[PDB]
Every structure is written in structure tokens, then in C-alpha cells.
Amino acid sequence: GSHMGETGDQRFGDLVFRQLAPNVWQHTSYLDMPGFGAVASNGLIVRDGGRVLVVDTAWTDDQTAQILNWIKQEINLPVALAVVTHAHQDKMGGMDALHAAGIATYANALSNQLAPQEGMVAAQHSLTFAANGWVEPATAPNFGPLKVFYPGPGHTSDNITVGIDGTDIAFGGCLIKDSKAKSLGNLGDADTEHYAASARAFGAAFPKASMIVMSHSAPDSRAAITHTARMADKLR
Amino acid sequence: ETGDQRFGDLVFRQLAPNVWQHTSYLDMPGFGAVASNGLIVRDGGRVLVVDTAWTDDQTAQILNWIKQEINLPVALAVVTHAHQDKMGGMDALHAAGIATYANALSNQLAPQEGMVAAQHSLTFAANGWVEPATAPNFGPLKVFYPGPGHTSDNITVGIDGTDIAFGGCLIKDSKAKSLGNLGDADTEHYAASARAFGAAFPKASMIVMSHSAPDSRAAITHTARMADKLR
Ligand SMILES: Cc1oc(C)c(S(N)(=O)=O)c1C(=O)O
Ligand SMILES: Cc1oc(C)c(S(N)(=O)=O)c1C(=O)O
Ligand SMILES: [Zn+2]
Ligand SMILES: [Zn+2]
Ligand SMILES: [Zn+2]
Ligand SMILES: [Zn+2]
Ligand SMILES: [Zn+2]
Ligand SMILES: [Zn+2]
């Protein structure tokens, strides 16, 4: 089962949406984490010609259905696919809303294999990766601007990252924490030996991205990557 | 030991008409000699190897025993994760012109683990089975990724047309008190991965593993019961 058991910001139900680029938005949803209260989780929405592509669900099915409603209102293009960046509640908790809506879903093969143990619904389709971390293109059909990179084990063994081609943006998901972070967040499923190398591999994979989007903080500069790697260095 | 054969530092045990276990040893601080096992499979007119020995020299001894005892070409080797017992001899396989295969993740981890990457990467479906285009002409070798356990990258191999499945370092002996080296292990998912190996090869009666002699299926259920205690 699951381990879980302001300017420019647009409120839409209990979610928040922020435009990051002409064709890119950040979605934000909240879940109350006993003791510490509201935990934000961010993902992305990308307009690619006549299609919308989603990175990560919200925490819940009901929140994820609200992402689809927001897309209908603000973009009014069909959602061609969603890719989720590992098998934890914040990234995959809303899979049923996507499947209910007939949306094709993608995850790391390992995320799909771990999903039952992690209390998640598996995506319909599985990404695989080359030894250099880049997605095998046959497993990323019509991903368009989404450039998927497996950096190595870090936050989880299955964590993947996504560059948005033709923009300044790369999405570190839960691997990367912001440059102000006092900790690496939830290390319950982390690989402490390989985390630092995986963070640095993400930086090297998207060497010119200037806006680093993350699950649990607002977008940051590239300093988030180096600061995260140096915090991870101390886990070894 | 009666019936076992020696070549240099290597010991070979015939498990089935076309299958041998190779065993090599390394002195580990405060542990004395640690055995590591792999497999040699005769597949008609060619030989397939599962896992290197600890070192290049030991791995060359495997290849020269194969020449002496079997006298068929070695077509390919599959190595079952990026640790020295399984991939320490990659340079000897490459020098001998043997095609090498490992989990893509093993190849990605190899530099950090001080190992040499294989020439080819295996990838796996969500159900754990190797994507067939990545494992061309593997003959009787059936490669399964059971999930993270002993390491994130550990893979397993069934030998079609035999009683044998190879758990590598994921599976420990049915009398074991411990799961051996957990330094790189996934404590949450280990038990499920061990059970997934059992379910992938449900008819295998001889379970070969890295650090103990062949056992029955009891090794799978005992490993899972030990791993349940890690959670
Ligand atoms: C801060 C935080 O809360 C949760 C619930 C997670 S995760 N993605 O590990 O579940 C994290 C994280 O660090 O990613
Ligand atoms: C007993 C043992 O010794 C070593 C050196 C290893 S491994 N494969 O983790 O390096 C193991 C193991 O448990 O696999
Ligand atoms: Zn997570
Ligand atoms: Zn997270
Ligand atoms: Zn977990
Ligand atoms: Zn090992
Ligand atoms: Zn081992
Ligand atoms: Zn290691």
C-alpha cells in the first residue's frame, strides 16, 4: 500500500496553476501530511501543436480530474498522454482519473513494476532507458518536446526526469530540491550511495536548462542541482 | 567435491548434461574466502556464460576450462548486476571477443561500482521479462528482472529445458541466518522481488545462487521470509 496511506498563480478548485512559458504550465496540488500540514506537489502541462502532454498526476484522482478540467478551460486541446516520474502518491496518485478519461499513460517500466507495492495504479505503457540514461525512443511514442532522462537511483530507484525541448525548462521531479532546501525531503525509498551522481547526471543531461522545476518547491535556477548534489554527497 | 573439476583457481560442478556451475573465491577482510557461483550452458554448438568470476584472471580460467572440457565457442555472457563477484572479469570476456549483456541499469551503475560496462544493454517490461529485441539469440536463457532486492539492477536467468533457475545474489541458502551484503539493497522491495523470481520460474526445482551451493525452491521462500524482516 501507499506510504501516504503568488502573482501569476491561478486558483482552480483546490489546485494552483502557473504559466512558466508560452506553452508550459506548472500544476500544483496539496495533501495534508500528518503533523507538518499541507505538502505541495508540482507537475507540468505542455501544449505541443494541437495536443496537451502532462507530467505527473496530482496526489489524488479528484485533483487529477481537476487538472483535466483546467486544461479544457484554459487550453481546450485534447490530452494526448501523461508521463509520471516515479511510483509515489504525489506523482502517480491520480492515475485512475487519467485512465477514466481514456488518456494514454507512461512510466518507467520499473515504476509500473513497483506500482502495486507502492499502492499506485500502473501506467498503461513502460519507458525503458539506454545505459547513458536517455529513454529508448521506441518506448516514448509521440512524446514531442518531452525529453525523458533516467539519471540513476536517487530519491527512488525508478525516478525519471523530463526536459521540455524548445524551452528553458527541465523537470527534476522529487530528485532535485531547491537551493534553499535544508534537507532532501523524503529519503524513505532513496538510494543514498548513488543519489549525488544521479543529481549531477540530471544537470549534465540538460546542460543549458535555466529554469529547474521540482516537485516540492517553486522553480529555481541551476543552483538547485548543484546544491542537491552537495547535500547528497553527505549521505555517503 | 567428488566429480567437481578444478582449473587454476576455479571449480566446476556439472548440474545437468549441458549446465555447469563455475565457482571462484576472493578473500574479504574478516570473512576469509567468499565463493561466487555462475553458470556455463552448452546450447548445441555454442556456450553461454552467466556471470564473470571475481577477477579477469579467474574469468580467463573459466574460458580456458570451457575450451579444454567443452571445446565449443562462447557466443555470449550475461552478467547479473554491477558488483565485483558478477562483473569483476568483464575485461577478460571482452579481450576473448565474447559479446556481453547486462541490465541497462547495471551498465549505467558500472562506473560508480568500479565495473566495466557490458557491450549491450538488456531492458525489461513492467512484468519483469526482458524485452526480446535486447536479448537476441539467447537460446535457452530466459532473463527476468524481479525488481530491486540485493541491488536495484539485479537480474535472474532461467535455463529453458532444464530444472535450473539462477537467482544470483538475490537468493540466499534455505538455512541462511542473513541475506549477505545488504549495502546496496532495497529493504522495502526485496521480499516481493524474491517472490517474483519464484513466480517467474515456477517449475524450476534447482535454484542456483551466487554465495551457496544449489538448493531447492526452499531457498526462494526462505529468502523472502528473511527479507520480510527488513521492512
Ligand atoms: C517532501 C515529500 O513528501 C512526499 C510525500 C514525498 S515523496 N515523493 O517521497 O512521496 C516527498 C519528497 O521528498 O519527494
Ligand atoms: C556475501 C557477499 O559478498 C559480496 C562481496 C557480495 S556482493 N555481490 O554484494 O558484492 C555478497 C552478496 O551477498 O551478494
Ligand atoms: Zn517520491
Ligand atoms: Zn515527492
Ligand atoms: Zn516505497
Ligand atoms: Zn552483489
Ligand atoms: Zn554477491
Ligand atoms: Zn554500491
Numbering used by the authors:
A (entry chain A): 25 to 29, 40 to 270
B (entry chain B): 40 to 270
Sentences from the paper on this structure:
The modes of interaction between SFC and NDM-1/VIM-2 were also determined. The key aspects for binding through the sulfamoyl and carboxylate groups in NDM-1–SFC and VIM-2–SFC structures were quite similar to those determined for the IMP-1–SFC structure. The sulfamoyl group coordinates to Zn1 and Zn2, the carboxylate oxygen O1 coordinates to Zn2, and the other carboxylate oxygen O2 binds to Asn233 and Lys224 (NDM-1)/Arg228 (VIM-2). Of note, there was no corresponding stabilization caused by Trp64 in the L3 loop of IMP-1, which holds SFC in the active site, in both NDM-1–SFC and VIM-2–SFC structures. Such structural differences in the L3 loop may cause differences in SFC affinity; the Ki values determined for inhibition of NDM-1 and VIM-2 by SFC were 9.82 μM and 2.81 μM, respectively, which are >10-fold higher than that of IMP-1 (0.22 μM). Although the inhibitory activities of SFC differed with individual MBLs, SFC bound to MBLs via their common architectures, through Zn1, Zn2, and Asn233, and through positively charged basic residue Lys224 or Arg228 of the L10 loop.
